[PDB]
Amino acid sequence: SKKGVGSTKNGRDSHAKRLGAKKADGQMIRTGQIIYRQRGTRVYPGVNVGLGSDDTLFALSDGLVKYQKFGPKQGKTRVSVVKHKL
């Protein structure tokens, strides 16, 4: 019935950090604004994209965000800053 408990050996995790992207396609953004959170490079930096020491990807100029495919079989993803009408 009511037996002993303890040593479940599992059921532990950490605080789920808000990781992923930080911009939406179609948004007019400015320089110094963060676009993506990740480890390593699952999303590759395009033009005017800077890297913050926590493997953060942010914008370097003012313009629109767009996505592109590259790689031998186009399985890799780039994010490019296509500037607005200027």
């Binding site: 009511k2 037996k3 002993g4 408990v5 303890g6």
Partner: protein, 182 residues
């Protein structure tokens, strides 16, 4: 050891103890159909100690007799036939060709009484020693798990039920000995 490993060690020791107990209870006087009653008693072949399985074969054609089959009928059957008589049997044996066929009429009520008494006392000694080993295992367990009471109690009844199962097996074998005694 773990509590389950404690049970495993206790079960190994109890299996050895049961081999011992079966060995003693076999030799104890019954209606005497036990193949191991004769097996644990060595025979004086030409003045030397010999076993039976390594020398002959055992069988039971009727359910009141025993049959001994040796290889040699001129040199080996006599060495076992002489020691079959004048023993705890108390019956006159005969030889039918290459096999000794020994009948076992039921024991008298008095000799059966001492035989049952001594068998029960042997089982009692085995019981006391098994419980002593169980208490030793419980001492190692109280050196082992001294934390959650509900778990230590679970270990207590685990050991208790293992002991009860082995007691049941030993008692069933005792009942078998008593029934073949009839």
């Amino acid at each position: 050891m773990s509590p389950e490993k404690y049970l495993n060690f206790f079960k190994e020791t109890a299996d050895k103890k049961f081999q011992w107990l079966k060995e003693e209870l076999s030799k104890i006087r019954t209606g005497r159909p036990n193949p191991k009653l004769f097996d644990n008693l060595l025979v004086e072949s030409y003045g030397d100690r010999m076993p039976m399985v390594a020398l002959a074969q055992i069988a039971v054609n009727p359910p009141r007799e025993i049959v001994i089959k040796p290889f040699d009928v001129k040199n080996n059957i006599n060495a076992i036939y002489s020691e079959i008589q004048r023993a705890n049997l108390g019956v006159q044996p005969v030889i039918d060709g290459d096999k000794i066929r020994i009948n076992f009429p039921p024991m008298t009520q008095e000799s059966r009484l001492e035989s049952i008494k001594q068998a029960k006392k042997v089982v009692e000694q085995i019981h006391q020693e098994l419980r002593s080993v169980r208490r030793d295992t419980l001492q190692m367990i109280k050196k082992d798990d001294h934390k959650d009471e509900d778990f230590e109690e679970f270990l207590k009844e685990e050991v208790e039920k293992v002991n009860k199962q082995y007691i049941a097996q030993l008692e069933t074998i005792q009942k078998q000995k008593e029934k073949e005694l009839l």
